[PDB]
Amino acid sequence: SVTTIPFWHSMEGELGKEVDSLAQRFNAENPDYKIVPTYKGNYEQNLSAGIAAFRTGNAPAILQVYEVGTATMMASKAIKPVYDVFKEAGIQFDESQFVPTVSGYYSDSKTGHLLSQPFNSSTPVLYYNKDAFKKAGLDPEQPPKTWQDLADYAAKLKASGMKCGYASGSQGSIQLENFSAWNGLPFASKNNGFDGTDAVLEFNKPEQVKHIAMLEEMNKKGDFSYVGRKDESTEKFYNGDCAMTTASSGSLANIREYAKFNYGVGMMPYDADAKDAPQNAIIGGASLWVMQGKDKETYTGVAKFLDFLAKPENAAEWHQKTGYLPITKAAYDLTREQGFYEKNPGADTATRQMLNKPPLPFTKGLRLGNMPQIRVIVDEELESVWTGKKTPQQALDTAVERGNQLLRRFEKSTKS
């Protein structure tokens, strides 16, 4: 037989074509199953569409869902954990192959087993202009390792004639979520939400407040430019406006294509005063969920497809062609062995950040309900610091209080 396996996703353009190519290869290699990818819209649209279809008995078998939708999928009663899909298919499933801070975001807090499989994963890194560094008398092979050094570098790069020292983008919440994990701090109680829906937000502590205050001082001096339009920080970097920026690891391919200068990619700076720093970064992007209600041939095909995506050759290909992270340690090692990092300098930096230290219980990821709305609140409150409306402490306190109201609404929504 050939079992058709619908896979609904949000990958447009060339990324969608790569999804199609992988499905076509899987289908050729596994002739009893036919993965059928369909683009269903953006992340919010695909999540809504998949759940609504599940309610009427017409869900796809596989649904790509962004990282901030994880709590929603867990509360939906609509998913079969990936670990269970493999077990019920009778297919061996080695969860240790994944980079632990990539699969960790999507794993069960009690058992460690995978609930959904990381698909397109990213993390923020530091892009920097090596030619600008040289002109400022900095070592182009030594990007700043701490925020304190970054502030000094930004001042020297501005003074040497760069229009902009350091730019950071609209993604303020993602930067503060990563700041907390990378500095060894919880963003929320209950191990970053993993241990329950009674978690509360905790990112208004001294290190976060100090970090935002530092950025605000840099802002006041003209050394930090907050540029809040989507991807504006990346464009200001690759256009030569900004000497340094923190942006998604997935932006490297665009940077390599448009930058008219020698760029480098460093790990995120950390707070020099934070004892546990640098710790580990956390992922963004999306994962693949498997829907309930399907037959055994469907789940066998799903398991085989998820396995295929994680095989070293296909996981390496994915990382090399799309710019997303290698989801497995074997895919990273293979990519290196193939010389790809000599042709694409800096494309290994993000993985090295993911493996910097083994994660703490509260640095595996962030698991909060209503997280899309919490991110907007955090983004807004940080924007109020840059405008001079609020102090760092006032903004983070406000974001914690407003965000906690969202967490409580989500918690009550799960109660019968």
Side-chain angles (χ1 to χ4, degrees), residues 48 72 85 96 104 112 118 129 157 162 194 199 269 306 326 340 349 355 368 398 414:
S48 289
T72 310
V85 172
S96 80
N129 181 329
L157 290 150
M162 291 295 285
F194 276 69
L306 294 182
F340 181 86
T349 298
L355 298 165
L368 298 171
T398 301
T414 68

mmCIF file of all heavy atoms in Angstrom, residues 48 72 85 92 96 104 110 112 118 129 157 162 194 199 269 306 326 340 349 355 368 398 414, unseen atoms left out:
data_model
loop_
_atom_site.group_PDB
_atom_site.id
_atom_site.type_symbol
_atom_site.label_atom_id
_atom_site.label_comp_id
_atom_site.label_asym_id
_atom_site.label_seq_id
_atom_site.Cartn_x
_atom_site.Cartn_y
_atom_site.Cartn_z
ATOM 1 N N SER A 48 -3.750 27.520 13.992
ATOM 2 C CA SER A 48 -5.217 27.588 14.091
ATOM 3 C C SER A 48 -5.874 26.578 13.154
ATOM 4 O O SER A 48 -6.863 25.904 13.512
ATOM 5 C CB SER A 48 -5.669 29.004 13.716
ATOM 6 O OG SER A 48 -5.305 29.921 14.724
ATOM 7 N N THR A 72 0.399 25.611 23.668
ATOM 8 C CA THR A 72 -0.904 25.482 23.025
ATOM 9 C C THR A 72 -1.100 24.064 22.540
ATOM 10 O O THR A 72 -2.159 23.459 22.745
ATOM 11 C CB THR A 72 -1.018 26.481 21.870
ATOM 12 O OG1 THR A 72 -0.635 27.804 22.307
ATOM 13 C CG2 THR A 72 -2.399 26.421 21.167
ATOM 14 N N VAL A 85 4.918 8.054 19.101
ATOM 15 C CA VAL A 85 4.722 7.680 17.705
ATOM 16 C C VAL A 85 5.734 6.613 17.304
ATOM 17 O O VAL A 85 5.405 5.589 16.696
ATOM 18 C CB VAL A 85 4.811 8.928 16.805
ATOM 19 C CG1 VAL A 85 4.811 8.558 15.336
ATOM 20 C CG2 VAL A 85 3.680 9.909 17.115
ATOM 21 N N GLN A 92 12.992 2.094 16.434
ATOM 22 C CA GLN A 92 13.933 2.555 17.446
ATOM 23 C C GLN A 92 14.160 4.059 17.324
ATOM 24 O O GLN A 92 14.233 4.614 16.221
ATOM 25 C CB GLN A 92 15.270 1.821 17.306
ATOM 26 N N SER A 96 19.192 10.768 22.052
ATOM 27 C CA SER A 96 20.469 11.397 22.327
ATOM 28 C C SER A 96 21.125 11.977 21.087
ATOM 29 O O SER A 96 22.093 12.726 21.236
ATOM 30 C CB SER A 96 21.431 10.413 22.987
ATOM 31 O OG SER A 96 22.030 9.550 22.043
ATOM 32 N N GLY A 104 15.674 19.879 23.644
ATOM 33 C CA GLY A 104 15.220 20.117 25.000
ATOM 34 C C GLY A 104 13.999 21.006 25.065
ATOM 35 O O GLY A 104 13.143 20.823 25.934
ATOM 36 N N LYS A 110 9.019 15.603 32.746
ATOM 37 C CA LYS A 110 9.157 14.486 33.674
ATOM 38 C C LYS A 110 10.035 13.384 33.094
ATOM 39 O O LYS A 110 10.901 12.841 33.787
ATOM 40 C CB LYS A 110 7.770 13.954 34.041
ATOM 41 N N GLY A 112 11.807 13.506 29.922
ATOM 42 C CA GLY A 112 12.828 13.864 28.965
ATOM 43 C C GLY A 112 12.525 13.486 27.538
ATOM 44 O O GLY A 112 13.271 13.886 26.640
ATOM 45 N N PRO A 118 12.252 19.059 16.758
ATOM 46 C CA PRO A 118 12.723 20.342 16.221
ATOM 47 C C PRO A 118 12.944 20.226 14.723
ATOM 48 O O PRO A 118 13.410 19.201 14.244
ATOM 49 C CB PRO A 118 14.048 20.588 16.956
ATOM 50 C CG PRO A 118 14.475 19.221 17.449
ATOM 51 C CD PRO A 118 13.196 18.455 17.711
ATOM 52 N N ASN A 129 31.456 43.424 11.933
ATOM 53 C CA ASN A 129 32.141 43.875 10.719
ATOM 54 C C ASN A 129 33.651 43.894 10.975
ATOM 55 O O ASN A 129 34.149 44.766 11.691
ATOM 56 C CB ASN A 129 31.575 45.256 10.375
ATOM 57 C CG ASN A 129 32.156 45.856 9.112
ATOM 58 O OD1 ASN A 129 33.310 45.614 8.752
ATOM 59 N ND2 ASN A 129 31.354 46.666 8.436
ATOM 60 N N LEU A 157 33.940 52.018 17.654
ATOM 61 C CA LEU A 157 33.552 51.872 16.262
ATOM 62 C C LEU A 157 32.826 53.115 15.779
ATOM 63 O O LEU A 157 33.103 53.616 14.680
ATOM 64 C CB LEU A 157 32.690 50.613 16.099
ATOM 65 C CG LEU A 157 33.512 49.329 16.280
ATOM 66 C CD1 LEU A 157 32.661 48.164 16.844
ATOM 67 C CD2 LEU A 157 34.152 48.935 14.963
ATOM 68 N N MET A 162 32.000 54.653 12.003
ATOM 69 C CA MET A 162 30.794 53.899 11.705
ATOM 70 C C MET A 162 29.571 54.720 12.083
ATOM 71 O O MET A 162 29.575 55.443 13.080
ATOM 72 C CB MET A 162 30.790 52.565 12.450
ATOM 73 C CG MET A 162 31.873 51.595 11.910
ATOM 74 S SD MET A 162 31.550 51.096 10.200
ATOM 75 C CE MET A 162 30.208 49.930 10.398
ATOM 76 N N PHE A 194 8.572 24.615 32.514
ATOM 77 C CA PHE A 194 8.487 23.194 32.179
ATOM 78 C C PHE A 194 7.764 22.395 33.241
ATOM 79 O O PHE A 194 7.106 21.400 32.904
ATOM 80 C CB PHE A 194 9.892 22.632 31.991
ATOM 81 C CG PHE A 194 10.442 22.866 30.623
ATOM 82 C CD1 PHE A 194 10.784 24.124 30.194
ATOM 83 C CD2 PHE A 194 10.574 21.811 29.738
ATOM 84 C CE1 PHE A 194 11.326 24.336 28.922
ATOM 85 C CE2 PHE A 194 11.089 22.020 28.477
ATOM 86 C CZ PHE A 194 11.458 23.288 28.067
ATOM 87 N N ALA A 199 3.556 28.593 36.715
ATOM 88 C CA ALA A 199 4.787 29.379 36.673
ATOM 89 C C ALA A 199 4.478 30.871 36.655
ATOM 90 O O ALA A 199 3.432 31.323 36.181
ATOM 91 C CB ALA A 199 5.489 28.995 35.387
ATOM 92 N N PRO A 269 27.462 37.972 23.375
ATOM 93 C CA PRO A 269 28.132 38.444 24.592
ATOM 94 C C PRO A 269 27.331 37.998 25.810
ATOM 95 O O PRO A 269 26.125 37.769 25.740
ATOM 96 C CB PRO A 269 28.081 39.971 24.453
ATOM 97 C CG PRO A 269 27.870 40.256 23.006
ATOM 98 C CD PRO A 269 27.019 39.089 22.527
ATOM 99 N N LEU A 306 10.140 11.391 10.229
ATOM 100 C CA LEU A 306 10.890 12.098 11.256
ATOM 101 C C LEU A 306 12.298 11.531 11.379
ATOM 102 O O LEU A 306 13.273 12.278 11.545
ATOM 103 C CB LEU A 306 10.145 12.000 12.585
ATOM 104 C CG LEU A 306 8.801 12.729 12.614
ATOM 105 C CD1 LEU A 306 8.161 12.606 14.000
ATOM 106 C CD2 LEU A 306 8.915 14.170 12.195
ATOM 107 N N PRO A 326 21.897 22.712 12.602
ATOM 108 C CA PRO A 326 21.853 21.240 12.549
ATOM 109 C C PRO A 326 21.178 20.736 13.817
ATOM 110 O O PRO A 326 21.553 21.122 14.931
ATOM 111 C CB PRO A 326 23.337 20.844 12.500
ATOM 112 C CG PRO A 326 24.039 21.964 13.245
ATOM 113 C CD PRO A 326 23.253 23.226 12.901
ATOM 114 N N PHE A 340 32.318 22.548 4.838
ATOM 115 C CA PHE A 340 31.334 23.616 4.651
ATOM 116 C C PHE A 340 31.672 24.863 5.466
ATOM 117 O O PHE A 340 31.367 25.981 5.038
ATOM 118 C CB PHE A 340 29.932 23.100 5.021
ATOM 119 C CG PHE A 340 28.835 24.109 4.840
ATOM 120 C CD1 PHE A 340 28.223 24.267 3.610
ATOM 121 C CD2 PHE A 340 28.347 24.842 5.930
ATOM 122 C CE1 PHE A 340 27.212 25.171 3.426
ATOM 123 C CE2 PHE A 340 27.331 25.748 5.761
ATOM 124 C CZ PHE A 340 26.753 25.919 4.525
ATOM 125 N N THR A 349 29.112 28.932 14.364
ATOM 126 C CA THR A 349 29.113 29.639 15.637
ATOM 127 C C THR A 349 27.870 29.330 16.448
ATOM 128 O O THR A 349 27.961 29.044 17.643
ATOM 129 C CB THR A 349 29.273 31.133 15.386
ATOM 130 O OG1 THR A 349 30.535 31.323 14.740
ATOM 131 C CG2 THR A 349 29.291 31.902 16.703
ATOM 132 N N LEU A 355 25.974 24.293 22.326
ATOM 133 C CA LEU A 355 26.727 23.295 23.078
ATOM 134 C C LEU A 355 27.703 23.895 24.091
ATOM 135 O O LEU A 355 28.568 23.188 24.603
ATOM 136 C CB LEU A 355 27.497 22.415 22.104
ATOM 137 C CG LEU A 355 26.654 21.614 21.127
ATOM 138 C CD1 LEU A 355 27.583 21.124 20.029
ATOM 139 C CD2 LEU A 355 26.058 20.464 21.886
ATOM 140 N N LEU A 368 5.718 28.306 28.120
ATOM 141 C CA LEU A 368 4.676 29.163 28.687
ATOM 142 C C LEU A 368 3.490 29.267 27.748
ATOM 143 O O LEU A 368 3.652 29.393 26.529
ATOM 144 C CB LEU A 368 5.275 30.571 28.901
ATOM 145 C CG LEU A 368 6.459 30.664 29.894
ATOM 146 C CD1 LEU A 368 7.086 32.053 29.842
ATOM 147 C CD2 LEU A 368 6.034 30.214 31.315
ATOM 148 N N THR A 398 6.744 45.962 34.763
ATOM 149 C CA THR A 398 5.459 46.024 34.065
ATOM 150 C C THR A 398 5.259 44.805 33.177
ATOM 151 O O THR A 398 4.168 44.228 33.127
ATOM 152 C CB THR A 398 5.355 47.307 33.246
ATOM 153 O OG1 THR A 398 5.488 48.426 34.123
ATOM 154 C CG2 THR A 398 4.018 47.382 32.577
ATOM 155 N N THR A 414 -6.905 25.668 31.056
ATOM 156 C CA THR A 414 -6.600 24.247 31.042
ATOM 157 C C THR A 414 -7.389 23.479 32.098
ATOM 158 O O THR A 414 -7.308 22.254 32.142
ATOM 159 C CB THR A 414 -5.099 23.978 31.226
ATOM 160 O OG1 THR A 414 -4.696 24.348 32.550
ATOM 161 C CG2 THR A 414 -4.227 24.766 30.205
#
